[PDB]
């Protein structure tokens, strides 16, 4: 029966797990979402230089674009929405001074938009 025993169920790890934050991407004016999620540190802050290591991975894993082409794009902006419900957009195509760390634990989702043509 279904009420047999719940203890029979599996277990989990206590060492150190990761979180799954849903991200988005805009291409050709149309967004491409496939329920894909991104990995992040638990209760740990991170920067763009480091976090990018995981992001860039999806960039090529999605369509196979390079960091040299995505930069030459007509436009490049990154959107980050915190658990608070607030979202901010950062214009990478015009950002050479911006720089600040963030807490993944306080992150909800992100929406990347790169206009290339």
* DSSP 8-state code for residue 93: G
User: Minimal CA–CA distance to 78: which of 105, 106, 98, 103?
Assistant: 98
For 86-113, give one letter per residue: b (16+ CB within 10 A) or e: eeeeeebeeeeeeeeeeebeebebbbbb
Q: Is 13 exposed, middle or buried (0-12, 13-18, 19+ CB in 10 A)?
A: exposed
- For residues 112 and 54, give the distance between their C-alpha atoms in angstroms, rounded to a whole number: 14
CATH architecture of 19-115: Roll (3.10)
Helices assigned H by DSSP within the chain: 48-62, 69-72
Distance in angstroms (rounded) separating the CA atoms of residues 23 and 55: 10
């Amino acid at each position: 029966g279904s009420t047999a025993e719940k203890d029979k169920l599996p277990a989990t790890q206590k060492a150190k797990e990761m979180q799954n934050v849903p991200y988005t991407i805009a291409v050709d004016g149309i967004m491409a979402f496939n329920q894909s999620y991104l990995n992040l540190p638990k209760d740990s802050q991170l920067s763009y230089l480091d976090l990018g290591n995981k992001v860039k991975a999806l960039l090529y894993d999605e369509r196979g674009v390079t960091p040299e082409k995505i930069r030459n794009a007509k436009s490049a902006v990154y959107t980050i929405t915190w658990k608070d419900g607030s979202k901010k957009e950062v214009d990478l195509k015009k950002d050479s001074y911006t720089a600040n760390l963030f807490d993944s634990n306080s992150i909800k989702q992100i929406d990347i938009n790169v206009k290339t043509k």
